[PDB]
RNA sequence: UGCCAGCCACCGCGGUCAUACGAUUAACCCAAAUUAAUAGAUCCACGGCGUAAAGAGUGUUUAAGAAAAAAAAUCACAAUAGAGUUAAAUUAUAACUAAGCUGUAAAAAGCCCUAGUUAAAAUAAAAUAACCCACGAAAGUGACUCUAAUAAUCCUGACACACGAUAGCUAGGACCCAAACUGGGAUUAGAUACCCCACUAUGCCUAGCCCUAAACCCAAAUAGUUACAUAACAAAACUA
RNA sequence: AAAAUG
């Protein structure tokens, strides 16, 4: 993509290599932002349209206690919330993209709808992705099983620590008086 | 603290250079009735045909030898702004961890 | 091998006379054309002829 | 200060370019045996690039040589000479299936 | 209610200005975290315009000095008998052994390419790897 | 808002205009920060920063829009197409 | 009253259906002034030229203008003008065989000095190569060989100079084949058309004119940039 | 092949 030029280290015989210095620099902020929303009782949803690891995304989300969407994204899901989901619902406060592109190789619906509804989006963007709309983009690899498992485990522990430390903070709040 | 330039210079993929006609070890992680999904480990997973000799010996987790042809099959077509990604790699089967 | 396309169409950057003049833009579509059904033809006119030869002779 | 940074130098893995069968060769109008391999044995047409597989210069040169030899009195136009009919097949066209 | 405009700017600006004007009377929870830890680039929409003319991308190809030796090794003997193991992080290949011999032969004050090549090829026999030259 | 009935179109426009809200930076809450010369599809707009005593000498629609926004002092000239949407 | 009477600056209104015609009431704006007409002031482009009006058919040059930072000039292939040659087909012309040949959806007309095969000058044109993209300023050029040869140490520039497809004119020559026009035969109510046959001007060479094209790639020339930025379609938007 | 008008 034209917008991945600053996020790349170079090109190894046609194949572009993403430098991991800015990847880690972005991932620190990404995990911190993801953990803070979970700490402040926020709804976190893992959007990912990729028919290889979708089962792993629902397993990770269920273990985290957050919500997931790996199936076909309907039209007015995030915009027409009072109709698609229920009379009055709570919009997800954070959207995690593990695969910003769908099976058509087009930008996802949710990355546009989150920007429309002022919903923070943290996303793993590949060399063919568009990071202009993602609030917290992390340049990485989303097609490697080890890379996606690493990202899923990192986002699992980021939520787990946030929730647990919220519980001990509330426990100390109870002892405060 | 080790720097990415330093570890990338010593990465095995850097040592391999071009991926044309290179012998690699891969491990099968998925099995279809006749297609074997072999992860040689570079970026993507190649798909191969089950041979006629010792066909029952190919199971999930088996290590095999591949002659890599291309890391990622992409090409340009008429009126296309970017390539058409196949999300796969090109490789052929030679043996199964001859040791 | 695919025929070359450089310097064929009429563009601002093309200095020479256009070579190819497309009826429709050369954009590869997402669907192929439906297969054509073959036109039928009469059968065994040859054997009908030898059938009628008996009738004309006998 | 990093000594492991990539250096901007020419590609070492640059494979040599493919050559036409007659790169750095001499095409002549008197070599009917050579000119006959690029013409059809039954009709006498001159094969194109997609059939012969020659880079841009030698295709025009072989065409000019055939056209010159056909009028100077060295090669027949309508057919390929049966004496040179048994030459090795260089063209990529297959008639009998 | 809110602002559903994407091309105007980023989400943080469209929430902050709405609250400053007084339309959005409720602070979203993520605004405080954005203020505390902002990202590197503001999430403003930028249209991917095509690049015409003589302009070219600014990415530079990754090439080192060891690639010159690896090209000679692959041109002479091709792929090594020891197949490449990409799972091992500390895996050293036959070409890696060849280039490690080449660098030390260079440090030994040898400037001739033939001397740097054939001597390394013979030295590999001391460790006992088989070289298959391609004719 | 577009509908078969005029009242329905009015209601649709009212309910759909709130969802798309801009914020206009107004210098000292009466005039824009700097003169703006903008080229839209086919409509040219030239707007110049104006003093406190020059109240909304603009087009008859720009005056209404700026009255809704909060701009009290402005001068605007529109050239080319005068299409309302553009 | 009902496309009648009539009204209007533009749109336009007149249906036993008029807030637009005529009258009444009511209302609005001016005011000793109010309307109508004619003159004025102001109003066109520091904008554009692919599809709406616009890039002139081409090159050179005079006058005139910009030289604002630095670089360059010249190579396979069908530029052009002369001279020579012809591989396939076609035909004038002879010999054997047949009574048919050509013709269309079907026919008719025409030719039976016809048709097939074997030999054959002259004229015209130059399969495949060409899925190539070169030459020439443009028009234009691709069967072969030879000679001459393709300006500028390279900005723009006319009403001046030189070219300028086909069509048409004059004189001489050529005429296989194609064909305006014309004469027959089909179809049609008509067919002075599309369909079939024959033939003339013409297409061919030399010399002299004519100076026109959807001469269009509807995108002017010279050096550039991918910055801002999609009226629509189309070949993306732009600078000096 | 054929074939007009409102
Ligand atoms: Mg990817
Ligand atoms: Mg030219
Ligand atoms: Mg068209
Ligand atoms: Mg079509
Ligand atoms: Mg108007
Ligand atoms: Mg009146
Ligand atoms: Mg009136
Ligand atoms: Mg009245
Ligand atoms: Mg005008
Ligand atoms: Mg015009
Ligand atoms: Mg022109
Ligand atoms: Mg003209
Ligand atoms: Mg002449
Ligand atoms: Mg004659
Ligand atoms: Mg007759
Ligand atoms: Mg020819
Ligand atoms: Mg020149
Ligand atoms: Mg000039
Ligand atoms: Mg002329
Ligand atoms: Mg003439
Ligand atoms: Mg004649
Ligand atoms: Mg005729
Ligand atoms: Mg007639
Ligand atoms: Mg023309
Ligand atoms: Mg024009
Ligand atoms: Mg000019
Ligand atoms: Mg549109
Ligand atoms: Mg009539
Ligand atoms: Zn060659």
Q: DSSP 3-state assignment of B60?
A: coil
Q: What is the DSSP letter of B28?
A: E
How many beta carbons lie within 10 A of that of residue B34, not counting itself? 8
* Cα–Cα distance for residue pair F74/F76, rounded to 1 Å: 7
How many beta carbons lie within 10 A of that of residue E99, not counting itself? 22
* Cα–Cα distance for residue pair C5/C22, rounded to 1 Å: 12
Show the tokens assigned to B50: 């089950």
CB burial of residue C35 (10 Å; 0-12, 13-18, 19+): exposed
CA trace torsion E74, E79, E82, E86 (10° rounding): 90
**Cβ distance D60 to D51 under 8 Å?**
no
* Cα–Cα distance for residue pair C35/E85, rounded to 1 Å: 48
Report phi then psi at A96, rounded to 5. Answer: -105, 120
Q: Do F20 and E1 touch (CB under 8 A)?
A: no
Nearest to A135 among E6, E43, E50 (CB): E43
Show the tokens assigned to A13: 């015989």
Residue in the block written with tokens 């070492």: D12
How does DSSP assign D18-83, residue by residue?
P--TTTT----SS-HHHHHTTB-SSS-PBP-HHHH---HHHHHHHHHHHHHHHHHTSS-SSS--TT
Window 53-112 of chain E: CB closer than 7 A to strand G: 53-55
**Cβ distance A151 to A98 under 8 Å?**
yes
Residue E120 makes CB contacts below 8 A (sequence gap 6+) with E98, E101, E102, E105
* Cα–Cα distance for residue pair B97/B99, rounded to 1 Å: 6
**Cβ distance A127 to A16 under 8 Å?**
yes
How many beta carbons lie within 10 A of that of residue E135, not counting itself? 3
Report phi then psi at E107, rounded to 5. Answer: -65, -25
Domain extent listing, chain D: 1-97
Tell me how many helices (H) and strands (E) chain A has: 5, 7
Resolution, expressed in angstroms to one decimal: 3.4
Report phi then psi at F59, rounded to 5. Answer: -60, 160
Q: What is the DSSP letter of A107?
A: B
- Integer angstrom CA distances of residue F54 from E94, F35, F45, F75: 83, 15, 19, 8
* Cα–Cα distance for residue pair D41/D35, rounded to 1 Å: 12
**Cβ distance A44 to A122 under 8 Å?**
no
Phi-psi region of B8 (alpha: psi -120 to 50; beta: other; left: phi over 0): alpha
**Cβ distance A68 to A58 under 8 Å?**
yes
What's the Rg (C-alpha) of chain B? Answer: 16
Show the tokens assigned to E18: 């709405």
Report phi then psi at B28, rounded to 5. Answer: -80, 125
Chains A and B touch (3+ CB pairs under 8 A): yes
Q: What is the 3-state secondary structure (H, E, C) of chain E?
A: CCCCCCCCCCHHHHHHHHHHHCCCCCCCHHHHHHHHCCCCCCCCCCCCCCCCCCCCCCCCECCCCHHHHHHHHHHHCCCCCCCECCCCCCCCCHHHHHHHHHHHHHHCCCCCHHHHHHHHHHHHHHHCCCCCCCC
* Cα–Cα distance for residue pair B58/A30, rounded to 1 Å: 41
Partner E contacted by F68 (CB < 8 A): no
**Cβ distance B62 to B55 under 8 Å?**
no
Angle at C14 between CA C13 and CA C19, to 5 degrees: 155
Residue A22 makes CB contacts below 8 A (sequence gap 6+) with A6, A7, A139, E40
- CA E38 to C1' G184, in angstroms, rounded, equals 96
Q: What is the DSSP letter of A155?
A: H
Cα A38 to the chain's mean position, in Å? 13
CB burial of residue A113 (10 Å; 0-12, 13-18, 19+): buried
Window 49-88 of chain D: CB closer than 7 A to strand G: 49-50, 56-57, 59-60, 63-64, 67-68, 70-72, 77-78
Q: DSSP 3-state assignment of D94?
A: coil
Residue in the block written with tokens 């026999």: E125
* Cα–Cα distance for residue pair A91/A79, rounded to 1 Å: 10
User: How would you list the strands of the sheet with A44-48, edge to edge?
Assistant: A67-69, A44-48, A94-99, A121-125, A136-139
How does DSSP assign C9-29, residue by residue?
S--SS--S--S---SS-----
* Cα–Cα distance for residue pair A163/D61, rounded to 1 Å: 79
Q: How far is E13 from chain F (nearest CA, A)?
A: 9
**Cβ distance B46 to B26 under 8 Å?**
yes
List the one residue out of B85, E10, E38, B71 whose CA is nearest residue A1.
Answer: B85
Q: DSSP 3-state assignment of C30?
A: coil
Show the tokens assigned to C17: 């006379």
Cα E100 to the chain's mean position, in Å? 22
Residue E119 makes CB contacts below 8 A (sequence gap 6+) with E105, E110
Which residues of B sit within 8 Å Cβ distance of A?
4, 8, 13-14, 17-19, 29, 39, 43-44, 71-72, 82, 85, 87
The upper half-sphere exposure of residue E4, i.e. CA atoms within 13 Å in the direction of its Cβ, equals 12
Q: DSSP 3-state assignment of A151?
A: helix
List the one residue out of E69, E124, E63 whose CA is nearest residue E99.
Answer: E69
Show the tokens assigned to E54: 């003589």
* Cα–Cα distance for residue pair A161/B99, rounded to 1 Å: 45
Name the packing angle between helices A20-39 and E29-36 (round to 10°). Answer: 140
Show the tokens assigned to D63: 């065409």
Angle at D74 between CA D70 and CA D79, to 5 degrees: 60
**Cβ distance B57 to B13 under 8 Å?**
no
Q: Which nucleotide is the nearest neighbour of E54, by CA and C1'?
A: G226
Q: Which residues of A48-76 are buried (b: 16+ CB within 10 A; e: fewer)?
A: bbbeebbebbbebbeebebebbbeeeeee
Number of residues that this document lists for chain F: 86
């Amino acid at each position: 993509h034209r917008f991945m030029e600053p996020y790349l280290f170079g090109s190894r015989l046609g194949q572009d290599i993403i430098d991991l210095e800015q990847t880690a620099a972005h991932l620190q902020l990404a995990l911190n932002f993801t953990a803070h929303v979970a700490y402040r009782e926020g709804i976190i949803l893992f959007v990912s349209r990729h028919r290889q690891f979708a089962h792993l995304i629902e397993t990770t989300a269920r273990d985290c206690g957050e919500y997931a969407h790996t199936r076909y994204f309907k039209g007015g899901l995030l915009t027409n919330a009072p109709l698609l989901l229920g009379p009055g619902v709570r919009l997800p406060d954070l959207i995690i993209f593990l695969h910003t592109l769908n099976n058509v190789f087009e930008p996802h619906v949710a990355v546009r709808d989150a920007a429309k509804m002022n919903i923070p989006t943290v996303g793993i963007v590949d060399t063919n992705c568009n990071p202009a709309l993602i609030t917290y983009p992390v340049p990485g690899n989303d097609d490697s099983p080890p890379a996606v498992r690493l990202f899923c485990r990192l986002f699992q522990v980021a939520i787990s620590r946030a929730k647990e430390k919220r519980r001990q903070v509330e426990a100390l709040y109870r002892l405060q008086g | 603290v080790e720097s990415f330039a330093s570890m990338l210079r010593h990465s095995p993929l850097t040592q391999m250079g071009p991926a044309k006609n290179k012998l690699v070890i891969g491990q099968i992680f998925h099995i279809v009735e006749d297609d074997l999904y072999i992860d040689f480990g570079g970026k993507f997973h190649c798909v191969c045909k089950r041979p006629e000799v010792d066909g029952e010996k190919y199971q999930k987790g088996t290590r095999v030898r591949l002659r890599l042809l291309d890391l990622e099959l992409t090409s340009r077509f008429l009126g296309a702004t970017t390539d058409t990604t196949i999300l796969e790699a090109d490789a052929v089967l030679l043996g199964l961890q001859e040791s | 091998a695919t025929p070359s396309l450089r310097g064929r169409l009429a563009r601002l950057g093309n200095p020479r006379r256009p070579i190819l003049k497309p009826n429709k833009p050369l954009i590869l579509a997402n669907h192929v054309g439906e297969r054509r059904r073959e036109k039928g033809e009469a059968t065994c006119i040859t054997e009908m002829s030898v059938m009628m030869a008996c009738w004309k002779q006998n | 200060s990093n000594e492991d940074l990539p250096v901007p130098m020419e590609n070492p893995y640059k494979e040599p370019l493919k050559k036409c069968i007659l790169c750095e060769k001499h095409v002549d109008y008197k070599n009917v045996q050579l000119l006959s391999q690029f013409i059809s044995p039954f009709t006498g047409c001159i094969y194109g690039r997609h059939i012969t597989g020659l880079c841009g210069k030698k295709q025009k040169e072989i065409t000019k040589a055939i056209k010159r030899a056909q009028i100077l009195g060295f090669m027949p136009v309508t057919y390929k000479d049966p004496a040179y009919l048994k030459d090795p097949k260089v063209c990529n066209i297959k008639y009998r299936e | 209610a809110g602002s559903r405009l994407e091309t105007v700017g980023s989400i943080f600006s469209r929430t902050r200005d709405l609250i400053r004007a007084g339309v959005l009377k409720e602070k979203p929870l993520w605004l405080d975290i954005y203020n505390a830890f902002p990202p590197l680039r503001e999430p403003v929409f930028r249209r991917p315009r095509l690049r015409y003319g003589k302009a070219k991308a600014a990415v530079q190809d990754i090439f080192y000095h060891e690639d010159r030796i690896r090209a000679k090794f692959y041109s002479a003997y091709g792929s090594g008998p020891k197949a490449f193991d990409l799972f091992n992080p500390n895996f050293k290949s036959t070409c890696q052994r060849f280039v490690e011999k080449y660098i030390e032969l260079q440090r030994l004050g040898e400037t001739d390419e033939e001397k740097l090549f054939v001597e390394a090829g013979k030295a590999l026999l001391a460790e006992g790897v088989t070289l298959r030259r391609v004719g | 808002g577009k509908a078969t009935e005029r009242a329905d179109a009015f209601r649709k426009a009212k309910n759909r205009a709130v969802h798309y809200l801009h914020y206009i930076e107004r210098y000292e809450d009466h005039t824009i920060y700097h003169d703006i010369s903008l080229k839209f599809k086919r409509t040219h707009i030239k707007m110049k920063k104006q003093p406190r005593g020059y109240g909304l000498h603009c087009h008859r629609a720009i005056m209404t829009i700026c009255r809704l926004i909060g701009i009290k002092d402005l001068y605007a000239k529109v050239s080319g197409s005068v299409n309302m949407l553009n």
